[PDB]
Design a protein around this ligand. Structure first.
Ligand SMILES: *[C@@H]1O[C@H](CO)[C@@H](O[C@@H]2O[C@H](CO)[C@@H](O)[C@H](O[C@@H]3O[C@H](CO)[C@@H](O)[C@H](O)[C@@H]3O)[C@H]2NC(C)=O)[C@H](O)[C@H]1NC(C)=O
Ligand SMILES: *[C@@H]1O[C@H](CO)[C@@H](O[C@@H]2O[C@H](CO)[C@@H](O[C@@H]3O[C@H](CO)[C@@H](O)[C@H](O)[C@@H]3O)[C@H](O)[C@H]2NC(C)=O)[C@H](O)[C@H]1NC(C)=O
Ligand SMILES: *[C@@H]1O[C@H](CO)[C@@H](O[C@@H]2O[C@H](CO)[C@@H](O[C@@H]3O[C@H](CO)[C@@H](O)[C@H](O)[C@@H]3O)[C@H](O)[C@H]2NC(C)=O)[C@H](O)[C@H]1NC(C)=O
Ligand SMILES: *[C@@H]1O[C@H](CO)[C@@H](O)[C@H](O)[C@H]1NC(C)=O
Ligand SMILES: *[C@@H]1O[C@H](CO)[C@@H](O)[C@H](O)[C@H]1NC(C)=O
Ligand SMILES: *[C@@H]1O[C@H](CO)[C@@H](O)[C@H](O)[C@H]1NC(C)=O
Ligand SMILES: *[C@@H]1O[C@H](CO)[C@@H](O)[C@H](O)[C@H]1NC(C)=O
Ligand SMILES: *[C@@H]1O[C@H](CO)[C@@H](O)[C@H](O)[C@H]1NC(C)=O
Ligand SMILES: *[C@@H]1O[C@H](CO)[C@@H](O)[C@H](O)[C@H]1NC(C)=O
Ligand SMILES: *[C@@H]1O[C@H](CO)[C@@H](O)[C@H](O)[C@H]1NC(C)=O
Ligand SMILES: *[C@@H]1O[C@H](CO)[C@@H](O)[C@H](O)[C@H]1NC(C)=O
Ligand SMILES: [Ca+2]
Lengths: 103, 851
């Protein structure tokens, strides 16, 4: 029915510790004015943008969801692979071995 | 555009409104008052992380050494019994009586075989295994491709009943033992708790391809780690059927490779080249094996053959020490059909002292000369296999494993050491298990030294399952904060034990019997400090490191800037390494001291599901309160059974633990004393819709009992995303509702707002509970619409989720990601760096089957 699958996922968070962020959005051939105020003593932000019904800049979307994807390129993570310690002891090349049994 | 100060004062007014509403409705400082008032009913105990880590590490070591001693006993008896066995060919009179796991439960006498009389067992139900178990004898599994009446099989069925006795005596000494099994080198598996074969007794569409000699634990115990280099021979003559068989053989040969074995696939026709993007021996993990399989399936047959140009490539790749390797058992697998070139010169030059073996396979139904192909194996320590059709694909790889285990046998008792397997799913269903393996040698001619015909092979491999639920009881997490946990690690970095390890096969790519090997860095969010900690742990040394992390939330929608302390120690006498993650506010906890025998009662009567108006609507975390209690998903049943088992608890002194029961009863008492003395006295507020509190003890009362019908949060408080989230941020957190989730929704549920209690007991900071308010959306949109509307003044949180807008249409899609509506806004915002982000993969997530 359903199969296991590498699914790249994204999360967002307030990068800066500042509380006020203002500017003008550089939409396609238009201008969008905004002001972001982070409410104190909470995890909420107040985005005071003043532009609606203007030209559409919705070329793509930011889909924050478990989207099906291939994994990391495995041809790249074999050049500098993660640290890894193999088994300490192994048994090969014993001289008493009987080689007369090829088949 | 209003001036900055104007809307800044707007924000100040709305934020003070929200803070006042939350801290007045939930009851933060009043619950703090209760907790500091009752310092006499509990004592704050420390979580000395070093002590906890060493304690759990030595407990895990003791468990693994218990199973190691069981393996030693089983292998001792197996070798001793087989050494004292006399061959036969006449089993008509001397029956071999045994239970064949693939049998019919109906009392049908005609289900038996000429040489052997079958047992009809009596199966009882055991919840330890979850299936039908009979501890009187051991079942036998015989592959469908192997006849159960031949002489080899009947002799193996004879000398393996002392194994029945030792299985029983092993389980008597350690009642907690799971499957213990002798995986015979003739194809048999003889596992002790006799249960029917897992799903393939006699069932249509369902063919039993199980073969014990192909299992990961057998392949692990049967030999040492390899360095394979599969030389496929894609020349002209192998096209047609021979090529199809060659690619199937290569896939089924890669299937016999562990994470300790290193492999590459090359292909030669008048010039040699790799088949994939790799150019050196790469580790044979799941993803690399999948890449090699996908490259082999794309291979085409064309051109003349040059054996020297292919063997030069093979040896030159096996001499590449700049890469990480398993510096052991160097091998070359030649998947040709036949030819007239021995190439004695290339073997003489490259493989002179015979460090590298050569296994030659004559794949295909053809008539070319197999003289050089049989010679290459002889001169170079190898073996020669023939794969004329699909159906001979699956045995010859098992056979090269049979060959590789000679030098392991010739090193008599140095080689008999217990090895533990990666975390795989058990054949007979019990979920994630590791298994210890011990090879069993052939001891027929010893101290009366004889010819030693086949005394270089092994008899099989012993194996005993250890379940990952057996390990999670040696590492108890209910004295820690929910953000703290234990986790272990292989020397390959794969997590043996981790809270982000779920029963389920690991994904390897986009869809069109493998181990669940989840690396450590792929189970959490990878830092550069965490890479250092991983490399420190793998080296098997102790340490400690406190630092600031990025802790993805349990619901995989937010990220917090956490503050953790990784203490770790090696598990002695084992390759593992245990670590305990612990927040800074988690160094102390509450030990409920309720020993009056009547105080526990005076707190317990308050939990009954009839008083759900003086107190709120409660849920009980389904923990191991004690063995008589059996946890269920119907939470009201658990609450009931919990109440009855509270009713008569005094006689259960040596039965079930005072810690969890006292802690939960005390938390119920503190929660009730707040629902009575601060919420029942008020009984209603306009802005709110549901006032609730959650606690680490498991008590999660919600007041109205009607909005609690819209409460879908996990009863186990140690598994709620909002609770662990609220522990981190020392402020109020708005949990945006899940967009387009059929159920309690948003309007008839609300939006969660929560804060963590911050009590001090003798100067020790604690966070025992998080009071949460499900703010009603209508009152809040009313209080918000006293602002500018039409252009849009929106409210966003961590993760950029849409709490509401002034638009009165965005609020219809309340709880959506803001990027799904007006992406340009927060794409820009990310570029201002108000919003960072992290992309991480979840290799262990279910996925729709694409085309
Ligand atoms: C939107 O509606 C009203 C205001 O429009 C908010 O309720 C009021 O919030 C203010 C905050 O500054 C309080 O003063 C108002 O009364 C207070 O109530 C607390 C309760 O303990 C008292 O201790 C104070 O002394 C004061 O009397 C309060 N009004 C009421 C009737 O409670 C409302 O919370 C807001 N909606 C949301 C969702 O936040
Ligand atoms: C462990 O090794 C011993 C010997 O090292 C194996 O026992 C030997 O097995 C062979 C082949 O099964 C026997 O040879 C056969 O003998 C019968 C009767 O003599 C004959 O009819 C056959 O044609 C064949 O020659 C041999 O007798 C037997 N015993 C000895 C002392 O060699 C034993 O099978 C090995 N363990 C396992 C599990 O196979
Ligand atoms: C996951 O998100 C975190 C957010 O903390 C990312 O870490 C941050 O990444 C940026 C970009 O690389 C770093 O900026 C650079 O930092 C260095 C040194 O601080 C500075 O000299 C440069 O000029 C630049 O500003 C930032 O430092 C870093 N933060 C931390 C705490 O390390 C991270 O990159 C994201 N991705 C992954 C895979 O973790
Ligand atoms: C492991 O053994 C060493 C020495 O034998 C000891 O110092 C260390 O404390 C042990 N670790 C644990 C967790 O017991
Ligand atoms: C190890 O085996 C002994 C049997 O002598 C048993 O009493 C003990 O509980 C076992 N230890 C563990 C951790 O299971
Ligand atoms: C092998 O079979 C004989 C004949 O039934 C029996 O006496 C003997 O006990 C068997 N060997 C073992 C190890 O049980
Ligand atoms: C792999 O498959 C693609 C698709 O048919 C093909 O173009 C390519 O040549 C193949 N690779 C090799 C090495 O032939
Ligand atoms: C490996 O490293 C050595 C020394 O850095 C270098 O001479 C050689 O070309 C490298 N590659 C191989 C395949 O040996
Ligand atoms: C832990 O948190 C405190 C305050 O939140 C911070 O000052 C400290 O640096 C953090 N710990 C570490 C190791 O950074
Ligand atoms: C669970 O079972 C109990 C009793 O069997 C019942 O009262 C309750 O409604 C059930 N709940 C669900 C969600 O099935
Ligand atoms: C911001 O936008 C510019 C222009 O599109 C782009 O070049 C840049 O990479 C973005 N990010 C940063 C951090 O400058
Ligand atoms: Ca050819």
């Amino acid at each position: 029915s359903k199969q296991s699958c590498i699914t790249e996922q994204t999360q967002y968070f307030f990068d800066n510790d500042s509380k006020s962020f203002s500017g003008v959005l550089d939409c396609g051939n238009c201008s969008r004015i905004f002001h972001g105020e982070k409410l104190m003593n909470t995890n909420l932000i107040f985005i005071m943008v003043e532009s609606k019904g203007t030209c559409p800049c919705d070329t793509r979307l930011l889909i924050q969801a478990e989207q099906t994807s291939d994994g990391p390129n495995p041809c790249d993570m074999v050049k500098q692979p993660r640290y890894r310690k193999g088994p300490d002891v192994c048994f090969d090349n014993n001289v008493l071995e009987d080689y007369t049994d090829c088949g | 555009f209003p001036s900055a100060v104007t809307i800044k004062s707007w924000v100040d007014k709305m934020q003070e409104d929200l803070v006042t509403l939350a801290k007045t409705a939930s009851g933060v400082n009043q619950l703090v008052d209760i907790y500091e008032k009752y310092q006499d009913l509990y004592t704050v105990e420390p979580n000395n992380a070093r002590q906890l880590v060493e304690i759990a590490a030595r407990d895990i070591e003791k468990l693994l050494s218990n199973r190691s001693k069981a393996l030693v006993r089983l292998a001792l008896e197996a070798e001793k019994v087989q050494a004292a066995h006399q061959w036969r060919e006449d089993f008509a009179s001397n029956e071999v009586v045994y239970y064949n796991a693939k049998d019919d439960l109906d009392p049908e006498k005609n289900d038996s075989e000429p040489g052997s009389q079958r047992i009809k067992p009596v199966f009882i139900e055991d919840a330890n295994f979850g299936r039908q178990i009979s501890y009187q004898h051991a079942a036998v599994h015989i592959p469908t491709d192997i006849y159960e009446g031949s002489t080899i099989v009947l002799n193996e069925l004879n000398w393996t009943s002392a194994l029945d006795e030792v299985f029983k005596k092993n389980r008597e000494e350690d009642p907690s033992l799971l499957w213990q099994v002798f995986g015979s080198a003739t194809g048999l598996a003889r596992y002790y708790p006799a249960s029917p074969w897992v799903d393939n007794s006699r069932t249509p569409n369902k063919i039993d391809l199980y073969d014990v000699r192909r299992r990961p634990w057998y392949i692990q115990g049967a030999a040492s780690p390899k360095d394979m280099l599969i030389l496929v021979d894609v020349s002209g003559s192998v096209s047609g059927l021979t090529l199809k068989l060659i690619r199937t053989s290569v896939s089924e040969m890669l299937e016999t490779l562990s994470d300790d074995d290193f492999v590459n696939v090359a292909s030669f026709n008048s010039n040699a080249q790799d088949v994939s993007c790799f150019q050196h021996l790469v580790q044979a993990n799941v993803r690399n094996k999948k890449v090699l399989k996908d490259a082999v399936n794309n291979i085409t047959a064309k051109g003349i053959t040059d054996y020297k140009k292919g063997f030069s490539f093979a040896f030159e790749q096996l001499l590449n020490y700049n890469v990480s390797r398993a510096n052991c058992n160097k091998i070359i697998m030649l998947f040709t059909d036949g030819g007239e070139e021995r190439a004695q010169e290339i073997f003489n030059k490259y493989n002179k002292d015979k460090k590298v073996r050569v296994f030659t396979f004559s794949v295909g139904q053809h008539n070319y000369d197999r003289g050089p192909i049989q010679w290459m194996a002889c001169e170079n320590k190898g073996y020669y296999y023939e794969i004329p059709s699909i159906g001979a694909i699956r045995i010859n790889t098992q056979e090269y494993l049979d060959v590789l285990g000679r030098p392991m046998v010739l090193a008599g008792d140095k080689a008999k050491q217990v090895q533990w397997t990666n975390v795989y799913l058990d054949a007979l269903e019990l979920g994630l298990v590791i298994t210890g393996t011990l090879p069993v040698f052939n001891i027929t001619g010893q101290f009366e030294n004889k010819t030693n015909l086949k005394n270089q092979l092994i008899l099989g491999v012993m194996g005993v399952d250890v379940s990952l639920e057996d390990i999670k009881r040696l590492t108890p997490r209910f004295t820690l904060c929910p953000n703290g946990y234990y986790f272990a690690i292989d020397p390959n970095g794969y997590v043996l034990l981790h809270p982000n390890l779920q029963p389920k096969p690991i994904g390897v790519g986009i869809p069109t019997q493998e181990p669940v090997t989840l690396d450590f860095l792929d189970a959490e969010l990878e830092n550069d400090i965490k890479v250092e900690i991983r490399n420190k742990m793998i080296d098997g040394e102790s340490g400690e490191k406190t630092f600031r992390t990025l802790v993805k939330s349990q619901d995989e929608r937010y990220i917090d800037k956490g503050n953790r302390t990784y203490t770790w120690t090696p598990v002695n006498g084992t390759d593992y390494s245990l670590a305990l993650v612990l927040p800074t506010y988690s160094f102390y906890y509450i030990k409920a001291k309720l020993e009056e025998t009547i105080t526990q009662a005076r707190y317990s009567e308050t939990l009954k599901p009839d008083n759900f108006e003086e107190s709120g609507y409660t849920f009980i975390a389904p923990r191991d309160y004690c063995n008589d209690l059996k946890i269920s998903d119907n939470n009201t049943e658990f609450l009931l059974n919990f109440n009855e088992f509270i009713d008569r608890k005094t006689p259960n002194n040596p039965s079930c633990n005072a810690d969890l029961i006292n802690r939960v009863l005390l938390d119920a008492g503190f929660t009730n004393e707040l629902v009575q003395n601060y919420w029942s006295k008020q009984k209603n507020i306009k802005g709110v819709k549901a006032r609730f509190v959650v606690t680490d003890g498991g008590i999660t009362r919600v007041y109205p009992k009607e909005a609690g019908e819209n409460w879908q949060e996990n009863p186990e408080t140690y598994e709620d995303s909002f609770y662990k989230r609220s522990l981190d941020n020392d402020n109020y957190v708005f949990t945006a509702p899940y967009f387009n989730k059929s159920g309690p929704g948003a309007y008839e549920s609300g939006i969660m707002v929560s804060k963590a209690v911050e009590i001090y007991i003798q100067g020790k900071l604690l966070k025992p509970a998080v009071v949460g308010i499900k703010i009603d959306v209508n009152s809040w949109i009313e209080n918000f619409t006293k602002t500018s509307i039409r252009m849009d003044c929106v409210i966003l949180d961590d993760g950029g989720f849409l709490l509401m807008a002034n638009h009165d249409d965005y609020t219809n899609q309340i709880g959506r990601f803001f990027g799904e509506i007006d992406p340009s806004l927060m794409r820009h915002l990310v570029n201002i760096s108000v919003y960072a982000f992290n992309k991480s993969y979840d290799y262990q997530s279910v996925c729709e089957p694409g085309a």
